[PDB]
Design a protein around this ligand. Structure first.
Ligand SMILES: CS(=O)(=O)NCCNc1cc(C(=O)O)ccn1
Ligand SMILES: [Cl-]
Ligand code: NI
Ligand SMILES: [Zn+2]
Length: 330
C-alpha cells in the first residue's frame, strides 16, 4: 500500500506532465497522495497563471465578512458579520493597516504559535467566495476555469444529463482570516491556487480517519451537535493542533506559498488561516473515484448550511432516499 502513514505529498510535474489534468490526478493517487487528504503541486518553471497582477485593484468585494470568534483559544466558533462593499485596492490597504497587519515573526512556526494564541481576540475581515477568475484565457494547463464539469462527470459515469454549472471563486485574505474544519459539499475534491501575496497554512485529517474528527467535534461543541447531525458542514468550528494532538486525532499540516496548487481529496477534512494579504482561487471537481463518496456523503438538513443550486441534482441522483428531507432543509 502506497503512503501508509498518510503523509502530505508534494509533486513537481514537468511541462509535459502538466498537459492532462485528469491523468496527473490519477498519477498522484497511484502514489498514495489521497491518503493524506491534501497534496501540494508545484507547477513547472515554464508555466504561469497570467502575466501580471498589476491591474486587479478595481475588483469589487461586495460583502466582506468580519470573522467574530467565541469560545477559547484552541476550541472556538466563528460567525460572519457582513460589512460594506470595498474594492480589492481598499481591502489591501486595510489588510496592511496597523490594526490588521501581520506582526513581526521569525518563521512560519512562530507565526503559527501567534495565530493559535491570539486569533480569538481579533476579528479579521475576509473577502471570501467571490465568483470570478484570475487565470489568463491563454493559459491552457491547470486553468481552474477550464476544467471538466462535475455534471459532465456524473453523466459520463452514470448515464444521464443533469442541470447545473460550477465555476471558480476568489478569496482575498488578510492576517488571521480563517477557514473552519470541513469537507467539501458532497465530499467532492477541491483545487486551490494561491495567485499572489502571503502564505496560507493548512491542516488536514486523512479520509480514513475523518470519523475520529467528527466524534471529537461532537464532544467539543455539544449544543451545535444536538442541533444538527452534520454541523461541521456549517463551516464555523475551529480546533487547534494542540487540542487535536491531546485527543489523539491523526492530522498533518503544510504551508502553501504563492504560485502553488493544493488539492483536497474526497472526505479530507481541512482548516487553516492566512498569513497576510493574499488572493486564492478555488473550485470543486470530480473524478470516477468520487462517485462512491458522493453516494455516502452526509448532509445538513437543519437549514443552516448554504443553498448551492448545483447540489440539488447530486443529492437527487446519488441519494434518492435522502432527497426529500434534504430539500425541506433548503
Ligand atoms: C471561510 S469559511 O470557513 O466560512 N468557508 C470555508 C470554505 N472552504 C475553504 C476555504 C479555504 C480558504 O479560505 O482558503 C480553503 C479551503 N476550503
Ligand atoms: Cl498576533
Ligand atoms: Ni474546502
Ligand atoms: Zn445543519
Amino acid at each position: 500500500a502506497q503512503n501508509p502513514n498518510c503523509n502530505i505529498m508534494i509533486f513537481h510535474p514537468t511541462k509535459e506532465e502538466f498537459n492532462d489534468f485528469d491523468k496527473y490526478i490519477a498519477y498522484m493517487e497511484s502514489q498514495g497522495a489521497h491518503r493524506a487528504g491534501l497534496a501540494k503541486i508545484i507547477p513547472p518553471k515554464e508555466w504561469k497563471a497570467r502575466e501580471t497582477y498589476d491591474n486587479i485593484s478595481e475588483i469589487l468585494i461586495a460583502t466582506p465578512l468580519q470573522q467574530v470568534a467565541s469560545g477559547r483559544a484552541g476550541v472556538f466558533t466563528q460567525y460572519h458579520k457582513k460589512k460594506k462593499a470595498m474594492t480589492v485596492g481598499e481591502y489591501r490597504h486595510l489588510a496592511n493597516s496597523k490594526k490588521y497587519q501581520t506582526p513581526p515573526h521569525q518563521n512560519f512556526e512562530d507565526l503559527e504559535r501567534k495565530y493559535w494564541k491570539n486569533r480569538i481576540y481579533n476579528s479579521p475581515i475576509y473577502g471570501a467566495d467571490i465568483s470570478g477568475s484570475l487565470f489568463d484565457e491563454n493559459t491552457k494547463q491547470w486553468n481552474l476555469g477550464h476544467l471538466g464539469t462535475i455534471q459532465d462527470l456524473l453523466e459520463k459515469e452514470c448515464g444521464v444529463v443533469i442541470e447545473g454549472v460550477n465555476t471558480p471563486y476568489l478569496y482575498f485574505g488578510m492576517w488571521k482570516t480563517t477557514f473552519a474544519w470541513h469537507t467539501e459539499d458532497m465530499d467532492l475534491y477541491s483545487i486551490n491556487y494561491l495567485h499572489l501575496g502571503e502564505p496560507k497554512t493548512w491542516y488536514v485529517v486523512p479520509p480514513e480517519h475523518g470519523q475520529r474528527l467528527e466524534r471529537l467535534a461532537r464532544e467539543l461543541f455539544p449544543g451545535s451537535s444536538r442541533g444538527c447531525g452534520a454541523f461541521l458542514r456549517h463551516k464555523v468550528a475551529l480546533i487547534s493542533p494542540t487540542v487535536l494532538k491531546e485527543n489523539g486525532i491523526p492530522f498533518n499540516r503544510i504551508t502553501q506559498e504563492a504560485g502553488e496548487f493544493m488539492v483536497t481529496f474526497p472526505y479530507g477534512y481541512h482548516a487553516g488561516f492566512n498569513h497576510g494579504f493574499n488572493c486564492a482561487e478555488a473550485i470543486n471537481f470530480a473524478t470516477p473515484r468520487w462517485i462512491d463518496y458522493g453516494k455516502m456523503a452526509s448532509q445538513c438538513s437543519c437549514g443552516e448550511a448554504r443553498v448551492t443550486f448545483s447540489m440539488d441534482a447530486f443529492v437527487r441522483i446519488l441519494q434518492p432516499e435522502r432527497y426529500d428531507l434534504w430539500k425541506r432543509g433548503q
